[PDB]
């Protein structure tokens, strides 16, 4: 009859008459839609360039609901002014469950900061040849040759978590600290109900990254509903302009992919392409979004149906989803990166041996129950 073959416990390559292939190994190499809701496509932007509101990532400001976030590997435009990002990899874990925004102003410019000027632009964040700055942050400078102290509160009326973002400037000279902020011993104190931190600038000459020898360290927090955050500074404050009322979702995530964007409909999605199948398992990628087959590190997995010519128990028990690309951890987190890669590769090898042995067990019981009735009849 046919030429399909199965593998068994003792013998392999058994020529049989019928088989069901439990592996979907193919995919359309594009980023199709998830149900009808289009994903978020950062393009040449980082996660850090998207929430800080890079001047070259203005086309993503308008989009506030998505199916998943698509980041490109080695993304060029993000954090245009050089500096640290305090708990950047922790914030990507927060934004891997957020399914909706509400980009609003906490401290509205032209009404919120009197006695200061909000026109602070840098040549590292230049947009269309002219120097610009972030779309969600304000660089406060002097007004009438004076930088007085500031104070602003914000009570969370939004009935949701509010992600507040700010930054502290770290200059390169002491003649530049006096020229902008007119004080040499400055501070930033951002307090809340369950948050309190005080920042102090560090004036030092750095290697030139994007042309600047000074740094801006970016910070964040998560306001609770009904809670108050109080900003207070003597200088060196890159002040919050916009923020986000966070709406949490269950099926979402950040994938890293170079696939072209198409207009499809799908049910599953991997960084190599979407999957349209009803088969139980897959070989494409462990990182899936949507209702998807289960990942096994196999190439040949068939269950025999008929005689030879001379599985829900595993799918119910996997229940784990892998999100690791290599962007999840830090320079100074390698004992936790090697622990995450031990756990992820350990569950991908237990559940591959479990799925293969159940096929090997069911193949010998099928071939001898079929060869039971040949001698009854």
């Amino acid at each position, epitope marked *: 009859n046919s030429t399909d073959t199965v593998d068994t416990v003792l013998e392999k390559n058994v020529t049989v008459t019928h088989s069901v292939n439990l592996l979907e190994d193919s995919h359309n190499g594009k980023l199709c839609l998830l149900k009808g809701i289009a994903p978020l496509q950062l393009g040449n932007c980082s996660v850090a360039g998207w929430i800080l509101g890079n001047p070259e990532c203005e086309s993503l400001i308008s989009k506030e609901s998505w199916s998943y976030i698509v980041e490109t590997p080695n993304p060029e435009n993000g954090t245009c002014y050089p500096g640290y990002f305090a708990d950047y990899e922790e914030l990507r874990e927060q934004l891997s469950s957020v399914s909706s925004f509400e980009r609003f102003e906490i401290f509205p410019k032209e009404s919120s900061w009197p006695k200061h000027t909000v026109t602070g*632009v*840098t*040549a590292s964040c230049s947009h*269309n040849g*002219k120097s610009s700055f972030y779309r969600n942050l304000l660089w406060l*400078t002097e007004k009438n040759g004076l930088y007085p102290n500031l104070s602003n509160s914000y009570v969370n009326n939004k009935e949701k978590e509010v992600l507040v973002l700010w930054g502290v400037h770290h200059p390169s*000279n002491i003649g*530049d600290q006096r*020229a902008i902020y007119h004080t040499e011993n400055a501070y930033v104190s951002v307090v809340s109900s369950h948050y309190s931190r005080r920042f102090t600038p560090e004036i030092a000459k750095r290697p030139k990254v994007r042309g600047q020898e*000074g740094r801006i360290n970016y910070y964040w927090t998560l306001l609770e509903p009904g809670d108050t955050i109080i900003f207070e500074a003597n200088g060196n404050l890159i002040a919050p302009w916009y923020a986000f009322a966070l709406s949490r979702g269950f099926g979402s995530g950040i994938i890293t992919s170079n696939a072209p964007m198409n207009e499809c409909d799908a049910k599953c999605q991997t960084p190599q392409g979407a999957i349209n199948s009803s088969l139980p398992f897959q070989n494409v990628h462990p990182v899936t979004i949507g209702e998807c087959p289960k990942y096994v590190r196999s190439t040949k997995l068939r269950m025999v149906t008929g005689l030879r010519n001379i599985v829900n128990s595993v799918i119910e028990k996997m229940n784990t989803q892998f999100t690791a690309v290599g962007k999840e951890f830090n320079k100074l987190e390698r004992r936790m990166e090697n622990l995450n890669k031990k756990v992820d590769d350990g569950f991908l090898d237990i559940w591959t041996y479990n799925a293969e042995l159940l096929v090997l067990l069911e193949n010998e019981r099928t071939l001898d129950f079929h060869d039971s009735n040949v001698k009854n009849l």
Partner: antibody
Amino acid sequence: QIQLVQSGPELKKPGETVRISCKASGYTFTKNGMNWVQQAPGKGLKWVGWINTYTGEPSYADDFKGRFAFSLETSASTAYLQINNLKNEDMAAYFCARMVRDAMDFWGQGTSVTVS
Amino acid sequence: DIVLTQSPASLAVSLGQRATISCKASQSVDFDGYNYLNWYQQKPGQPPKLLIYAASNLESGIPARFSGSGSGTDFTLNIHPVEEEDAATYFCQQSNEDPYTFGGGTKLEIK
């Protein structure tokens, strides 16, 4: 190679309107802005304003607010400057220039607008 | 508006001299250690040509005899050795605050 060619010289009467063109080529029209510099012979250069080619948002100086108005045609690479309407002042040359690094590096051939 | 005053009005220079063209702004044209002062050269009957951008970097395509320096409000343009093809008018232009403002000009006539 980068080039900005303009329209020819114009001769108007004080009371009607003129429209200057600036056909860019050799580079992507968006990702670079477009200045407009007024050279009046005998007075020196003056900055009319700047138009964002990606956004479309103009920004004028206050001495050029109200009459001078920039426009775009990004389907091709062409920027426009319309004056509404010409006095016997602003009888000058008009250069269109390009923003690269807060500067005007590639200029136009000049559009001699004479008001008679 | 930041008003910039060229100095001198126009300078007499022979071939092999050192021509110093200077302009002094009313306010400061730097922010975070980036001087926003550009230098332009205009031969008559031609558009101006960018030589030095902000405020010491030399643009590609310009001969290396041009060099400018300065910080804060005081900037100079120094030309040596002065070849004969530099018979033009020299402008300085700020890019710090809108609107952008040019100089008055300075003719470099060669003996």
